[PDB]
Design an enzyme around this catalytic site. Structure first.
Site, PDB file in Angstrom:
ATOM      1  N   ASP A  52       7.351  17.628 -16.451  1.00 44.60           N
ATOM      2  CA  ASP A  52       7.749  16.890 -17.637  1.00 44.60           C
ATOM      3  C   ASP A  52       6.601  16.016 -18.128  1.00 44.60           C
ATOM      4  O   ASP A  52       5.786  15.531 -17.340  1.00 44.60           O
ATOM      5  CB  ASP A  52       8.987  16.033 -17.346  1.00 44.60           C
ATOM      6  N   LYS A  88      11.250  -1.973 -21.385  1.00 48.63           N
ATOM      7  CA  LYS A  88      11.321  -0.524 -21.202  1.00 48.63           C
ATOM      8  C   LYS A  88      12.032   0.152 -22.372  1.00 48.63           C
ATOM      9  O   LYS A  88      11.480   1.061 -23.006  1.00 48.63           O
ATOM     10  CB  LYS A  88      12.014  -0.198 -19.875  1.00 48.63           C
ATOM     11  N   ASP A 108      10.450  18.677 -23.781  1.00 52.58           N
ATOM     12  CA  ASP A 108       9.191  18.298 -23.152  1.00 52.58           C
ATOM     13  C   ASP A 108       9.205  18.481 -21.640  1.00 52.58           C
ATOM     14  O   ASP A 108       8.281  18.015 -20.965  1.00 52.58           O
ATOM     15  CB  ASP A 108       8.831  16.848 -23.492  1.00 52.58           C
TER      16      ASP A 108
END
Lengths: 207, 989, 212
Positions: free
Chosen positions: B702, B771, B910
DNA sequence: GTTCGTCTGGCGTGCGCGCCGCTACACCAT
RNA sequence: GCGGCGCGC
DNA sequence: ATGGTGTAACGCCAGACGAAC
């Protein structure tokens, strides 16, 4: 100049007025003020706490209360109501937003006594926020109490400058004694009604 | 000038061509032409329709009559008219004199002979008869034979189709015959339009009342079958008598199906009707859609399209089969087009009025036919089952068809142990059809859109058909490759998940709990003496229990369907045909059970074809297990492998006794995936030669924060590239921790400066606080939303001074935005550039359109009720959609170049999945294509494209000059060297 | 007993003598797009029955002036009657998603209470009433669980039956029955439940309140 | 009648997919 | 269709 | 056990509207 008043009325019809009734209502009380074209407060009163806003919305009780309330009002050329900034997006204020509309409904139907024949509106909705902007009562796009300004109109006389409103000599005692008897209670309708009448004359009639 | 009534009449005539009811169309057309006010309603297309019908039946006299009505309209015969005349002369074997006079009259009218074979809708039988007619007078007439398909000459797609290079295209593990049988099973399943799946809920409990309930429901369903048949035939008689008059009706549309299929469809809709009711209009749309669909199915069944599809597909399987060779190695699309290909067409849908009228007709018929007694324990009174209620559904009042409570309670007592899925909802049992056009691919019989335009937006598809065919070849191949991936269900994982599911469930492991585990209110109400506040307290408690019970029911049903599909596919090999959205990202078509699902869904899936581990297969499985646990995110690869060797004993224990052992897998971040990986590694290490152990488990690689990787690559940002692992590093670089550190140093600067906000934030600037903000910035986070996220990250700290939310959240969002302005200067410059460009472009009254580096057109569908463009969603949505189109292009390039090396490739946007034996190769391709993607002037080509597209209309010159000013103001790239990406270990890890 | 049910059904409370002394009523049922009324006398004769379809109300805006215009033009088409009966829906101040309807209806119910009570200012006698819709459904046995069903079939039976001698429940004038039937058949393809539920509300009012 | 300017108010991370449900509760009577 | 949730990137 | 009935806080852009030629 029409962003505040709805529906649209010809400016000539507004400038030819002889007297208006300014009405401001809350959740427990309603107040009105009778002012003529000479800015003379011909009347100014409010009804004690009513039986509406008691959890249920019964149209019969609304008709009884509103009819008994408008039964005490004299005849006038225009009746001005408050159009609040309540939106259909504020689910917490849905009980209020309903109440006002009900009021605004019956006042539109009961006060337009000649609308069935000539179809000319005599009941208007004046933007409250614009009334606040006119008297510079705005703090962060929120209206403050105009109680101090009404107190100035009632107790301060010749401010070495042109008066904005006139009170008849035979009624100034009743008006000031009413103000001082209701100073301890939340009576923003009583003040905002008179302020709305003055704002109507200064903005729509004598610009 | 098209009209609704004209649409109804034309659809009537064409439907009569479908039902072979020529006398009906002739009757209605003659009656309409005979009246003055009705003759004006007819159109040349209708006369040409009936003309083509008599041509197909070989009726010369009737066709001459229709021609008389054409000249007496008086319209003029066009290409389709002469096509019908020539077809009738050819089918009837007329003399060459009439055909010659037809060609000379056609030459006098100015029509061309080839324009008939190019511009007229004729079947291969019609084309064959018309050709046979022309060959009688013009025998040397040949249509242009076009054989070679052009190869894409795009910069990035050149090497995919160039013959120069050693290709090793992978083949499936299944032989030719087995694949042909799988094709037969999938074809049968799609021809049935329904899939029955055994419900995994509870075991074999027959009970007493259930038997009687099932018997009653069966009797009622037979009675309703008879009533629906009788009412259907009576309705056909009524509509037929309405056709006997000069008025249009839905009679031939009812003559399109075998009636019994109509009754079974109505009974199926009645069985699947929800207990609370459905909108009458939506029910009509469903009945019309299913009627049209089954009409398409029967039409392909009887027209020979299914048999020709057999002959085509069975020869296509030679490329995919293990025990078969092809003349030349090639891609599936190339071989498919080289075989035939007929491609055929699909029947254009009816006008919306026809659909609504037919649906409401069928619904009302279902209401009238279905009846039942009062049930209980026959009854003296007999009432219908469906009722109009006229309730309020969504704001506006609407009529709702509602079932009788006795019918609802009957269905709930019967407890039907089977579930029904649509043929397009379950994975295909055979390799899907390769994509050759935006209108032909995926399932064999059901059409599948190429782009996922919600609710039939019609916008994108025409622009997909406009571009040259080769321009799409790349995407058309990639979507095929993802579709040809053979999957299978992991029996162990399914057995464990079901063992938990059928008992008490385990929400901690993503297994929904039955309603038996819902929280109960202790205890029952005790009103009313005391107290008026306790009535509302228990009222809110009951509301909370009902909320939790409902949400538990939602997860229970969703997982019931998903796990039931997994169980039905246990001993089967299935495929997931893929699709695209309007921006270009790929998605599987079966939505319930697929590898884009949750943890449980992923663990149930594994590659059907295995691959020997080789020299590093087992090691990559161990690294993949550590990744699935999430315990060593920050550590380098070497420490992940050493950690796996450390907890090897807990891995084996977790594999042997999953539910009774130490339960080490249950603590991992992805528990079920970790469990399956533990089983794979356990079997691998216990083999005599681990290097030869055949592995089926997919390994993921990933890209960490892929959006920021593409932005940093576009802006050539040095610090940003170092943050998202674009620069080679011995340890993985965390962008969130770096942003937290930058905001920390800003906090110290403002703390020494005298700012009150920075003094109270001392020791609280953490990674978890920034985050969500840093992650969601790529999707368009503003200062307000980021302030709300920081608020959400400050209130739960508890060890933070009181509220102070406004100062800390405002200052922290300003410092995060500033920190990203230093780390990602070019990124924010590009985001603002695309934002402003979309502002002006959409302000000119046009939606934003662009083309990916692979030749795929992307359009934004944001409009407001032609329909004016919604400029707000355009300007806010353009950057993220562009980045998404870029990572989609990268993924597709990786897929194609991995296919050239014979790897099994699947992707989650992805996350690139392949066999453990080929991970090292994939990471070498994944980077390479990436470097080859951003090496091209993407921003320059986009700017020049938008200048040629939107700054070309000479109407307004003010916006053409300001817009040409902003579009040509392309931000200058940074100093980062893109080649470094080829040596970055943790770019994809 | 009977008085308590008569208090669940009719609001506000009206004297039973004056209620039983009615000569004719107008039953009004309104929705979001249409309003319909039926004028019936004590002989159960439908003196009138129509609807003012296609109005400018709802559609996102709640303007009290436009409400006065539309409602005034609607009541201009209504004849004089002894009592005006409205539909009382089961909508509550809850269900926040459908509050726009509950406001709309109230506005209607407000102005209809104010404009039709032409003598209320002097005598204080209500001429506008609120009849519970669910109870009207229970009267015609149109209830299924907790949802009222369509009363279209009952209106169709009242309209297209020649036998049923004695107690037809409703009478249609010969000079107007053709218009009524052609209206019903012209609105059979569309869902016009207000038109049906108004007549059913009139019949139910007469059978429950006047001839008990 | 069209265009321009102003103001007022609404919005403020994007796309892809899947479940379910649309007065309520308590008690008394059958 | 909106609403209540859940899931992938 | 089941059914019925009675009671309870800021800034920015944009869409729309009104005025002006």
């Amino acid at each position: 100049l029409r962003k505040l008043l709805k529906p649209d009325i010809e400016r000539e019809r507004l400038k030819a007025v002889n007297s208006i009734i300014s009405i401001v209502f809350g959740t427990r009380r309603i107040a009105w003020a009778h002012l003529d074209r000479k800015l003379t407060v011909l009347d100014w009163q409010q009804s004690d706490r009513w039986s509406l806003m008691r959890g249920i919305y019964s149209s019969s009780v609304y008709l009884e209360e509103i009819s008994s309330i408008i039964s005490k009002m004299p005849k006038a050329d225009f009746y001005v109501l408050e159009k609040t900034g309540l939106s259909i997006q504020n689910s917490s204020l849905f009980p209020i937003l309903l109440h006002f509309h009900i009021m605004e409904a019956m006042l539109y139907a009961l006060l337009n006594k000649t609308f069935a024949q000539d179809g000319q509106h005599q009941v208007l909705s004046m933007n409250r926020n614009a009334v606040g902007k006119h008297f510079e009562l705005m703090i962060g796009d929120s209206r403050t109490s105009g109680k101090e300004l009404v107190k100035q109109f009632l107790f301060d006389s010749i401010l070495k400058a042109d008066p904005r409103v006139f009170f008849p000599s035979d009624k100034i005692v009743h008006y000031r004694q009413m103000f001082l008897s209701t100073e301890l209670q939340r009576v923003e309708e009583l003040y905002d009604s008179l302020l709305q009448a003055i704002a109507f004359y200064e903005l729509a009639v004598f610009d | 000038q098209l009209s609704g009534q004209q649409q109804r009449l034309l659809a009537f005539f064409k439907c009569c061509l479908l039902t072979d009811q020529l006398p009906l169309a002739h009757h209605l057309l003659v009656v309409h032409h005979g009246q003055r006010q009705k003759r004006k309603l007819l159109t040349l297309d209708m006369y040409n329709a009936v003309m083509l019908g008599w041509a197909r039946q070989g009726a010369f006299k009737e066709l001459v009559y229709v021609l008389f009505m054409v000249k007496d309209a008086g319209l003029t015969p066009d290409l389709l008219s002469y096509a019908a005349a020539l077809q009738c002369m050819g089918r009837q074997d007329q003399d060459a004199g009439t055909i010659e006079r037809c060609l000379e009259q056609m030459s006098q009218e100015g029509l061309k002979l080839q324009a008939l074979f190019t511009a007229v809708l004729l079947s291969e039988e019609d084309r064959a008869t018309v050709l046979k007619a022309v060959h009688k007078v013009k025998p040397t007439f040949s249509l242009p034979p076009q054989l070679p398909p052009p190869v894409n000459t795009s910069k990035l797609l050149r090497d995919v189709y160039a013959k120069d290079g050693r290709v090793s295209y992978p083949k499936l593990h299944l032989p030719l015959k087995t694949l042909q049988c799988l094709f037969e099973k999938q074809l049968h399943m799609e021809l049935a339009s329904r899939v029955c799946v055994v419900s995994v809920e509870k075991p074999t409990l027959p009970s007493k009342e259930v038997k009687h309930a099932r018997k009653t429901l069966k009797t009622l369903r037979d009675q309703w079958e008879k009533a629906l048949c009788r009412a259907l035939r009576e309705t056909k008689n009524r509509l037929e008598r309405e056709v006997y008059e000069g008025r249009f009706s839905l009679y031939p549309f009812l003559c399109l199906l075998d009636e019994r299929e109509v009754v079974r469809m109505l009974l199926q809709v009645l069985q699947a009707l929800p207990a609370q009711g459905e909108s009458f209009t939506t029910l009509a749309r469903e009945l019309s859609a299913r009627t049209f669909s089954r009409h398409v199915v029967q039409r392909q069944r009887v027209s020979g399209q299914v048999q020709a599809l057999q002959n085509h597909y069975r020869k296509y399987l030679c490329l995919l089969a293990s025990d078969a060779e092809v003349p030349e190695p090639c891609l599936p699309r190339q071989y498919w087009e080289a075989l035939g290909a007929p491609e055929a067409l699909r029947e254009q849908p009816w006008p919306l009025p026809v659909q609504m009228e037919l649906g409401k007709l069928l619904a009302e018929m279902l209401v009238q036919a279905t009846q039942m007694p009062c049930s209980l324990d026959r009854s003296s009174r007999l009432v219908p089952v469906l009722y109009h209620v006229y309730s309020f559904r969504n704001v506006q009042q609407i009529g709702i068809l509602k079932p009788h409570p006795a019918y609802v309670q009957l269905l709930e007592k019967a407890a039907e142990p089977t579930l029904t899925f649509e043929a397009v909802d379950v994975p295909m049992l055979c390799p899907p059809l390769p994509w050759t056009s935006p209108h032909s691919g995926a399932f064999l019989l059901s059409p599948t859109k190429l782009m996922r335009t919600v609710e039939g937006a019609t916008q994108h598809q025409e622009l997909l058909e406009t571009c040259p065919p080769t321009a799409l070849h790349g995407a058309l191949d990639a979507l095929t490759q993802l579709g040809n991936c053979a999957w299978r269900v992991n029996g162990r994982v399914l057995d464990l998940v079901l063992q938990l599911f059928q008992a008490k469930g385990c929400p901690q492991l993503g297994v929904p709990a039955p309603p038996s585990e819902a929280p109960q209110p202790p205890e029952a109400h005790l009103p009313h003496s005391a107290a008026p506040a306790r009535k509302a307290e228990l009222r809110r408690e009951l509301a909370h229990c009902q909320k939790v019970a409902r949400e538990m029911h939602s997860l229970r049903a969703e997982a019931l369907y998903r796990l039931s599909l997994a169980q039905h596919l246990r001993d089967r090999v299935f495929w997931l045909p893929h699709n695209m959205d309007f921006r270009g990202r790929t998605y599987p078509c079966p939505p319930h059970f697929n590898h884009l699902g949750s943890d449980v869904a992923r663990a149930l899936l594994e590659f059907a074809q295995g691959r020997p581990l080789g020299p590093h297969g087992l090691d990559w499985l161990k690294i993949h297990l550590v990744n699935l646990t999430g315990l060593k995110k920050r550590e380098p690869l070497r420490k992940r492998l050493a950690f796996a060797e450390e907890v090897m004993d807990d891995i084996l224990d977790s594999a042997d006794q999953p539910l009774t052992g130490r339960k080490w897998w249950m603590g991992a971040e992805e528990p079920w995936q970790t469990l399956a990986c533990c089983m794979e590694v356990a079997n691998a290490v216990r083999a005599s030669d681990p290097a030869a152990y055949v592995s089926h488990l997919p390994v993921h690689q990933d890209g960490s924060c892929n959006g920021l990787q593409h932005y940093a690559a576009l802006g050539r940002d040095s610090v940003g590239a170092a943050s998202v692992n674009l620069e080679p590093s011995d340890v993985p670089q965390d962008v969130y921790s770096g942003v937290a550190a930058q905001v920390e140093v800003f906090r110290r600067q403002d703390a020494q400066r005298g700012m009150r906000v920075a003094q109270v934030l001392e020791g609280f600037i953490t990674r978890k606080v920034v985050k969500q903000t840093v992650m969601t910035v790529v999707y368009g986070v503003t200062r307000y939303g980021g302030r709300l996220q920081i608020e959400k990250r400050l209130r739960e700290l508890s060890d933070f001074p009181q509220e102070f939310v406004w100062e800390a959240s405002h200052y922290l969002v300003r410092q995060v935005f500033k920190s990203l302005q230093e780390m990602f200067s070019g990124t924010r410059a590009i985001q603002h550039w695309l934002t402003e460009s979309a502002r002006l472009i959409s302000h000119m009254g046009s939606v934003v359109e662009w083309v990916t580096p692979l030749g795929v057109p992307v359009i934004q569908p944001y409009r407001l009720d032609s329909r004016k463009p919604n400029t707000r969603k355009q300007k806010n949505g353009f950057p993220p959609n562009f980045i998404h189109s870029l990572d989609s292009s990268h993924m597709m390039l990786t897929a194609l170049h991995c296919y050239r090396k014979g790897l099994t490739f699947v992707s989650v946007h992805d996350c690139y999945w392949t066999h453990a034996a080929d991970v090292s190769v994939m990471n070498q391709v994944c980077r390479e294509q990436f470097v080859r993607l951003h090496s091209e002037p993407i921003l320059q080509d986009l700017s020049r494209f938008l200048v040629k597209r939107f700054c070309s209309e000479p109407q307004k010159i003010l916006e053409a000059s300001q817009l040409k000013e902003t579009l040509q103001a392309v931000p200058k790239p940074g100093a980062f060297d893109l080649e470094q990406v080829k040596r970055s270990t943790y770019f994809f890890s």
